[PDB]
Amino acid sequence: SLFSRTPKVTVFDNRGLTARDIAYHRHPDAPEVTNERITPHQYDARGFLTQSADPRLHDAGRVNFSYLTDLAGGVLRTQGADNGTSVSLNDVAGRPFIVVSHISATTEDRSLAVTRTWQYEDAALPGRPLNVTEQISTEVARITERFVYAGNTGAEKTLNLAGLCVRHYDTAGLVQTDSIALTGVSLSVTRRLLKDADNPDTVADWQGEGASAWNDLLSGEEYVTLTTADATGTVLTTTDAKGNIQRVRYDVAGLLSGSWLTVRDRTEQVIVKSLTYSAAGQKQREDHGNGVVITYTYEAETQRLTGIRTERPAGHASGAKVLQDLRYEYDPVGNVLKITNDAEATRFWSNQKVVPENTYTYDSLYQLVSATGREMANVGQQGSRLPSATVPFPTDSSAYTSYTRTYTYDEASNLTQIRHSPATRSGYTTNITVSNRSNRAVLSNLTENAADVDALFTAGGQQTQLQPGLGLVWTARNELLKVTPVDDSENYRYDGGSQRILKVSVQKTSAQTQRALYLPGLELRSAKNGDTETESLQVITVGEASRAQVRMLHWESGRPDGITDDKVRYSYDNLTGSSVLELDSDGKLISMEEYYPYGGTAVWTVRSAVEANYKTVRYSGKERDATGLYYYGYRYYQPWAGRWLSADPAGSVDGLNLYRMVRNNPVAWKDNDGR
Ligand SMILES: [Ca+2]
Ligand SMILES: [Cl-]
Ligand SMILES: [Cl-]
Numbered sequence: 072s073l074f075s076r077t078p079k080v081t082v083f084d085n086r087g088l089t090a091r092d093i094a095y096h097r098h099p100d101a102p103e104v105t106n107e108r109i110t111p112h113q114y115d116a117r118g119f120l121t122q123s124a125d126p127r128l129h130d131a132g133r134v135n136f137s138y139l140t141d142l143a144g145g146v147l148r149t150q151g152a153d154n155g156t157s158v159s160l161n162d163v164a165g166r167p168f169i170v171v172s173h174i175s176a177t178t179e180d181r182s183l184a185v186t187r188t189w190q191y192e193d194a195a196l197p198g199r200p201l202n203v204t205e206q207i208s209t210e211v212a213r214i215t216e217r218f219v220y221a222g223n224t225g226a227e228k229t230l231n232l233a234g235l236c237v238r239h240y241d242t243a244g245l246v247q248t249d250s251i252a253l254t255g256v257s258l259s260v261t262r263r264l265l266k267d268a269d270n271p272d273t274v275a276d277w278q279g280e281g282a283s284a285w286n287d288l289l290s291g292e293e294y295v296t297l298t299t300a301d302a303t304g305t306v307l308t309t310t311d312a313k314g315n316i317q318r319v320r321y322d323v324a325g326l327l328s329g330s331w332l333t334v335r336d337r338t339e340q341v342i343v344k345s346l347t348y349s350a351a352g353q354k355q356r357e358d359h360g361n362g363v364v365i366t367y368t369y370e371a372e373t374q375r376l377t378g379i380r381t382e383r384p385a386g387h388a389s390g391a392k393v394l395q396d397l398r399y400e401y402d403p404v405g406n407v408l409k410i411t412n413d414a415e416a417t418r419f420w421s422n423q424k425v426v427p428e429n430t431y432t433y434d435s436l437y438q439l440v441s442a443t444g445r446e447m448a449n450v451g452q453q454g455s456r457l458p459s460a461t462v463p464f465p466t467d468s469s470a471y472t473s474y475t476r477t478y479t480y481d482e483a484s485n486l487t488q489i490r491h492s493p494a495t496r497s498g499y500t501t502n503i504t505v506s507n508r509s510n511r512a513v514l515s516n517l518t519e520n521a522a523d524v525d526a527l528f529t530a531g532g533q534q535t536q537l538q539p540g541l542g543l544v545w546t547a548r549n550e551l552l553k554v555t556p557v558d559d560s561e562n563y564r565y566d567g568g569s570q571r572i573l574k575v576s577v578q579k580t581s582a583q584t585q586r587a588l589y590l591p592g593l594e595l596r597s598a599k600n601g602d603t604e605t606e607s608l609q610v611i612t613v614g615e616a617s618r619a620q621v622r623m624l625h626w627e628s629g630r631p632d633g634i635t636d637d638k639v640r641y642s643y644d645n646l647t648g649s650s651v652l653e654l655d656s657d658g659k660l661i662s663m664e665e666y667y668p669y670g671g672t673a674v675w676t677v678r679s680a681v682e683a684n685y686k687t688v689r690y691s692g693k694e695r696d697a698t699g700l701y702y703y704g705y706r707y708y709q710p711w712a713g714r715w716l717s718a719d720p721a722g723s724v725d726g727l728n729l730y731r732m733v734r735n736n737p738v739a740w741k742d743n744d745g746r
Pocket of ligand 3: 670
């Protein structure tokens with residue numbers, strides 16, 4: 072009835088090119104009404120795409136993208152509503168030669184334009200890249216990257232280095248590759264940072280006649296990551312920069328069967344004792360170092376994840392208990408209709424039979440239009456801040472009250488309203504104002520007028536204000552550089568591939584400071600109370616960033632009382648990889664967290680006060696910063712707004728809307744990296 076006669080339709084021109092994509096929108100609220108949505112695409116004489124537009128902007132006679140191509144189809148220019156105008160040219164060898172971006176159309180505002188260029192080896196060499204250059208506006212060009220290659224001396228061959236880049240100087244400093252396997256895996260890499268790398272004023276500029284000069288712009292400290300690998304070129308062990316060793320083992324089918332951690336100067340301990348798999352190679356039964364067992368359950372027909380059961384089993388020293396018994400009910404195409412948890416200790420849902428347990432409804436476009444859950448009664452209205460930690464664990468259904476969210480979407484799939492309706496309290500509404508000529512959008516408190524929305528973004532689609540009186544600065548490569556209030560700042564540094572290597576937070580009244588350095592399987596965290604160290608911390612992280620991760624906290628200095636050194640924190644995730652429970656090495660609950668569909672926190676409780684401040688990874692297995700943003704990798708996310716802080720750097724690959732979050736269906740799908 073709701074989904075009847077609502078196909079996806081592809082309309083061709085007379086050359087078999089897609090002139091229109093047609094979709095059929097229907098809300099369950101109004102099942103009588105069906106809104107036809109036409110996405111037109113134009114092609115030129117050759118048959119290359121020239122224009123695309125979403126239904127909302129076509130309706131208003133405007134366009135989302137214009138493309139200008141060379142005669143082979145290579146796109147020399149893109150004018151985007153969301154991400155501005157950019158010009159591109161590859162050389163005859165197919166390599167990047169020049170890209171000019173940060174340009175706005177009215178002819179063309181070129182004044183803030185970034186020009187990125189490449190320099191290769193001369194024609195008598197193979198043509199490997201030598202440097203990348205970036206020139207902004209009227210400023211002098213800066214050399215942002217350099218590459219140095221190995222020859223093929225006997226020593227180099229002995230390290231499998233011949234002709235490969237051994238020194239890559241990037242936006243954060245140097246990455247040095249000292250050894251490679253027969254199988255091609257890097258066995259020893261070494262990172263050095265720029266001098267004065269905590270200051271967002273310092274940019275990479277690799278000026279100088281040779282490596283002796285470039286190295287003089289680097290800090291002294293070396294962070295060496297070592298690796299061991301099997302005959303298939305698959306990782307067996309990793310030694311981090313502070314000497315902590317992670318080890319894994321593979322079963323007869325090549326799947327992970329066990330893992331261990333050897334903290335520097337300790338003995339090896341079991342992190343994953345055993346791990347079995349279904350016929351499809353998906354996790355079946357997982358046994359942790361803390362004796363906790365995870366049992367995964369799959370629909371036999373569709374292979375969809377039906378159950379996640381976490382428990383301390385029979386004969387466990389801390390006593391048997393089912394900590395989680397998640398069950399999922401899908402509609403035919405695999406949207407999540409219902410989530411139940413019978414292990415829930417409070418027994419909250421069988422007490423409150425007015426609103427049902429995590430029920431979800433969708434429109435014909437599989438956008439989430441309604442959701443129900445529980446929040447802690449005390450949370451109050453959602454903003455950027457995390458709720459206060461409830462300590463100790465609540466012990467009764469009074470602690471949590473039910474809620475019902477309702478979501479409203481425009482013709483271009485912008486999330487314009489999150490309406491919150493609790494059981495017995497005053498509800499609130501978050502309104503998001505969409506631009507009249509783009510998918511740029513901000514909260515109503517920033518503006519309620521469509522025509523002023525694009526002025527809160529740079530040409531490239533980067534948001535300049537996070538909240539009222541909090542300002543945002545972006546790098547030449549559209550990465551978040553700095554959050555500044557208009558007196559607590561935060562700033563960031565990235566490597567060559569836009570992956571965050573550094574985060575520094577500063578509060579000046581005396582100036583208090585915290586620093587996070589992100590390395591392979593290791594975060595070196597510190598703090599100073601005015602050039603005097605209060606805290607020094609290794610977060611050893613075991614596993615992969617898209618799976619239920621295990622963290623080990625080792626203090627070099629400044630350990631708070633109430634935390635035993637080298638305490639392991641096991642994380643336990645839901646369908647979408649959000650960190651929901653933490654257990655300790657006895658299998659006992661440390662914390663529990665639950666989420667509103669789009670990633671705001673609705674429950675946050677911890678057994679102690681001091682333990683609450685050491686869980687960074689939360690929604691989608693990603694770090695929530697003190698700003699309230701989630702760092703995904705290539706972009707930062709706003710859980711209160713249910714949308715990205717900047718335009719998709721991959722363009723229209725995932726859809727025309729460059730700010731939309733996981734096709735507006737955050738309960739099933741999960742954005743891996745923000746690209
Ligand atoms: Ca349909
Ligand atoms: Cl417990
Ligand atoms: Cl939400």
